[PDB]
Amino acid sequence: KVQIINKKLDLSNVQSKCGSKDNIKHVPGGGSVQIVYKPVDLSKVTSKCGSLGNIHHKPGGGQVEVKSEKLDFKDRVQSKIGSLDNITHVPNKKIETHKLTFREN
Amino acid sequence: KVQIINKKLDLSNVQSKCGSKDNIKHVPGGGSVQIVYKPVDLSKVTSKCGSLGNIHHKPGGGQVEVKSEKLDFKDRVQSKIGSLDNITHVPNKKIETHKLTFREN
Amino acid sequence: KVQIINKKLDLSNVQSKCGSKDNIKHVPGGGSVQIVYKPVDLSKVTSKCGSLGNIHHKPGGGQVEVKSEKLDFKDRVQSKIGSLDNITHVPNKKIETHKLTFREN
Amino acid sequence: KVQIINKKLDLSNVQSKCGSKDNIKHVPGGGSVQIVYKPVDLSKVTSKCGSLGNIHHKPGGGQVEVKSEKLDFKDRVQSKIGSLDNITHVPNKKIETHKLTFREN
Amino acid sequence: KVQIINKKLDLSNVQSKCGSKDNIKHVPGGGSVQIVYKPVDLSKVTSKCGSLGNIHHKPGGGQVEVKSEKLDFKDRVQSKIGSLDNITHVPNKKIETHKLTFREN
Amino acid sequence: KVQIINKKLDLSNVQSKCGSKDNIKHVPGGGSVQIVYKPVDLSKVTSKCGSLGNIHHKPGGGQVEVKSEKLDFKDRVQSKIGSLDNITHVPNKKIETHKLTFREN
Amino acid sequence: KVQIINKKLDLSNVQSKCGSKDNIKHVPGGGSVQIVYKPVDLSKVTSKCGSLGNIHHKPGGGQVEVKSEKLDFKDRVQSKIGSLDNITHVPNKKIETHKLTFREN
Amino acid sequence: KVQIINKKLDLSNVQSKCGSKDNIKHVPGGGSVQIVYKPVDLSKVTSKCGSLGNIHHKPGGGQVEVKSEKLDFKDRVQSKIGSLDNITHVPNKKIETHKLTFREN
Amino acid sequence: KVQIINKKLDLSNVQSKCGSKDNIKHVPGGGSVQIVYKPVDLSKVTSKCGSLGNIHHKPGGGQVEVKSEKLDFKDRVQSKIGSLDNITHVPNKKIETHKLTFREN
Amino acid sequence: KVQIINKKLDLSNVQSKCGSKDNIKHVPGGGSVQIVYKPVDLSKVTSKCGSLGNIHHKPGGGQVEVKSEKLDFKDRVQSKIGSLDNITHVPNKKIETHKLTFREN
């Protein structure tokens, strides 16, 4: 007689490759700065303000400061570099199936 | 006669590769700074303010400070580098199935 | 006659690789700073303010400070490096199934 | 005649690899600082404020301070390094099934 | 005639590898600082404020301080290093099933 | 009858004021050189070579050497001078007779 | 009858003021050199080579050497001078007769 | 009848003021050199080589050496001087007769 | 009848003021050198080589050496000087007769 | 009848003021060297080589050596000086007759 079917299928952030594999090198003679900045951030915020009130959704952010007032090198700065990576690879199947299936009804 | 079917299927952050595998090297002669900044952050916040009130959702954030007022090198800074990574690999199947299946009804 | 089916299937943060395997090296001659900053953070916050009141959801954050007022090197800073990693690998199947299945009804 | 089925299936943080296996080395000549900062944090907070009151959910955060007012090196700082890791591996199946199954009804 | 089935299946933090196996080395010539900071923290807080009152949920956080006012090296700081890890491995199956199954009804 | 008068009157270097009275000041900030060079030399050489032979009259002379191969000032050289000689003379007969007389016969 | 008068009057270096009265001051901030060089030398050499032979009249001379190979000032050289000579003379007859007289016969 | 008068009057270096009265001051901040060099030398050499032979009249001379190979000042060199000579003379007859007289015959 | 008068009057170095009265001060902060060099030398050499032979008249001379190979000041060298000579003279006849007289015959 | 008068009047180094009265002060902070070098030398050498032979007149000379191979000051060298000579003279006849007289015959 009477039927009500409600299939509210919510879905987010699925099978999502966000990671970052990375060889990072840093060879300075003098005083340098390297900043690698990769905050992988996944979120799902739901804010329902049904009557009076407040939603102060204030997540903090990244803050990277490098301050240096005085900095001296009163003589020679040398850096004699032969090599860094002497890799001798003398010898690949990556079947990366990311499957999803909704065979409904 | 009467039937009410409610399939509220919520789903988030599934099969999500967020990790970061990374060779990190740092070879300075003088006084340097390296900052690798990767906060992997996964969240799901639900804030329902039904009557009067407040939702002060204030998560703290990352704060990385490197302060250095005075810094001197009153003579020579040398760095004679031959090599760093002498890898000699003398000899791969990565079947990474990420499967999901809802065979409903 | 009368039936009410409510399948509220909530699900979050499933099969999620967030770990970070990483060779980290640090070879300075002089006085340097390395900061590797990876707080893996998984959360699920549910704040329901039904009548008057407050929700002061204030989680603390990371705070990394390196302060150094005076710092001197009144003579030579040398660093003669031959090698770091002399790896000689002289000889892989990673079947990483991440399966999920809801065969409902 | 009358039936009410409520399958409130809540689920979070399942099969989630968050650990971080990592060779960490630190070979300075002079006075350096290395900070590896990985707080793996998993949480599930539920705060229901039904009538008047307060929810002062204030978890503490990490605080790493390295302060050093005066620091001197009044003569030579040398570091002659031959090698660090002389690994000679002269000879893998990682079937990492992460299975989950809800065959309901 | 009348039946009420309530299957409130709550579940959290299951099969979650959070441990971190890591070779950590620290070979300085002069006076250095290494801080490895990995508080693995798993929590599940439920705070229901039904009438008037307070919920001062204030867990303490980590606090690592290294303070050093004056620090001197009035002559030479040498560190002649041959090797650290001379590993000679001259010769693996890790079937890590993380299974979960709800065959209900 | 017979008379021979021989008045061989030799005379040299008589009543000769050769001295040098002198206020000498030297106020440098950085590395300077002052050389005041006043050899007062009075001589009377009589060399009679009557038959064969040699007269190797070789008096040595003054030799003032200031050699400086490397010389550095790697920071500031200041010299704030108020005064040097604050002489307040609040109060002369120099009858310098240099007489010579040969009242002969 | 017969008379021979021989008045061989030799005379040298008589009443000769050669002395040198002198206020000498030396106020350096950094590394300086002052050389005051006043050899007062009076001589009377008589060399008669009557037959064969040699007269190797070789008097030594002054030799002042200031050698300095390496010399550094790796920080500030200040010299704040108020005064040197605060002489307050609040009150002369120099009858310098240099007489010579040969009243012969 | 016969007379021979020989008045060989030799005379040298008579009434000769050669002395040197001198206030000498030396106030350095850093490493300086002052050399005051006043050899007062009076001589009268008579060398008669009547037959074969040698006259190796070789008097030694002054030799002042200041050698300094390495010399460092790795921090500040200050010299705050108020005064040196605060002489307050609050009150002269120098009848310097240098007489010589040959009233012969 | 016969007379021979020989008045060989030799004379040298008579009434000769060669002394040197001198206030000498030396106030260094760092490592300095002062050399005051005043050899008062009076001589009268008579060398008669009548037949074969040698006259090796070799008087030694002054030799002042200040050698210093390495010399360091690895921190501050201060010298705060108020005064040196605070002389307060609150009150001269120098009748210096240098007489010589040959009233012969 | 016959007369021979021989008045060989030799004379040297008479009434000769060679002494040196001198206030000498030496106030160093660090390691200094003061050398006051005044050999008052009076001589009268008579060398008559009548037949074959040798006159090896070799008087030794002064030899002042200050050798210092290594010398360090690894911290502060201060010298706060108020005064040295606080002389308060609150009140001269020097009749220095140097007479010589040959009233011969």
Do residues D34 and E35 touch, judged by C-beta distance below 8 A? yes
Nearby residues of C48 by Cβ (< 8 Å), 6 or more positions away: B47, B48, B50, D47, D48, D49
D to C contact (≥3 Cβ pairs closer than 8 Å): yes
Pick the residue from chain C with its C-alpha nearest to D93: C93
Q: Could you say which of H6, H36, H49 has the minimum Cβ distance to residue G53?
A: H49
User: Based on the number of CB atoms within 10 Å of its own CB, is I18 exposed (0-12), middle (13-18) or buried (19 or more)?
Assistant: buried
Mapped onto helix, strand or coil, the DSSP state of residue H90 is coil
Interface of E with D in 49-78 (CB under 8 A): 49-78
Do residues B15 and B100 touch, judged by C-beta distance below 8 A? yes
Q: Could you say which of H19, H53, H60 has the minimum Cβ distance to residue J61?
A: H60
Give the DSSP per-residue string, A35-85.
EEE---EE--EEEEE-SS----------EEEEEES-----S-EE--B--SB
Side-chain-facing half-sphere of B30: CA atoms under 13 Å: 27
Interatomic CA distance for residues E13 and C13, integer angstroms: 10
Pick the residue from chain J with its C-alpha nearest to E74: J74
Do residues H28 and H79 touch, judged by C-beta distance below 8 A? yes
Pick the residue from chain I with its C-alpha nearest to J2: I2
Question: Shortest CA distance to E1 belongs to which of C6, J52, D1?
Answer: D1
Radius of gyration (C-alpha) of chain D in whole angstroms: 27
Query: How would you list the strands of the sheet with I33-37, edge to edge?
Result: F33-37, G33-37, H33-37, I33-37, J33-37
Mapped onto helix, strand or coil, the DSSP state of residue G39 is coil
Interatomic CA distance for residues D64 and I16, integer angstroms: 84
Q: Look up residue E93 and give its DSSP letter.
A: B
Question: Mutate which of C1, C2, C38 to test chain D, going by most D C-beta atoms within 10 A?
Answer: C38
Residues of E in contact with J75 (CB under 8 A): 74
Pick the residue from chain D with its C-alpha nearest to C4: D4
Question: Could you tell me how many residues make up chain I?
Answer: 105
User: Based on the number of CB atoms within 10 Å of its own CB, is E49 exposed (0-12), middle (13-18) or buried (19 or more)?
Assistant: buried
Interatomic CA distance for residues F17 and D60, integer angstroms: 93
- Is F30 an 8 Å CB contact of chain H? no
Question: Shortest CA distance to B2 belongs to which of D55, F38, E17, D4?
Answer: D4
Separation in Å, CA of J46 to nearest CA in chain I: 5
Interatomic CA distance for residues D96 and D17, integer angstroms: 11
Q: How open is the CA angle J96-I22-G68, to the nearest 5 degrees?
A: 155
Q: How many Cβ atoms are within 10 Å of B65's Cβ, its own excluded?
A: 16
Query: How would you list the strands of the sheet with H77-78, edge to edge?
Result: F77-78, G77-78, H77-78, I77-78, J77-78
Interatomic CA distance for residues J9 and C89, integer angstroms: 107
Tokens of residue E1, six digits: 């005639």
Nearby residues of A90 by Cβ (< 8 Å), 6 or more positions away: B88, B89, B90, B91
I61 contacts J61? CB cut-off 8 A: yes
User: Based on the number of CB atoms within 10 Å of its own CB, is I88 exposed (0-12), middle (13-18) or buried (19 or more)?
Assistant: middle
Interatomic CA distance for residues D103 and B104, integer angstroms: 10
Alpha-helical runs (H) found in chain B: none
Q: Which amino acid is at J99?
A: K
C31 contacts B62? CB cut-off 8 A: no
List the determination method.
cryo-EM
Question: Shortest CA distance to A63 belongs to which of A35, A23, A22, A26?
Answer: A35
Interatomic CA distance for residues H34 and H24, integer angstroms: 10
User: Based on the number of CB atoms within 10 Å of its own CB, is A68 exposed (0-12), middle (13-18) or buried (19 or more)?
Assistant: middle
Mapped onto helix, strand or coil, the DSSP state of residue B32 is coil
Q: Could you say which of D6, D42, D81 has the minimum Cβ distance to residue C81?
A: D81
Question: Shortest CA distance to B19 belongs to which of H37, A42, H100, D57?
Answer: A42
* G32-53 as b/e: b if 16+ CB within 10 A: bbbbbbbbbbbbbbbbbbbbeb
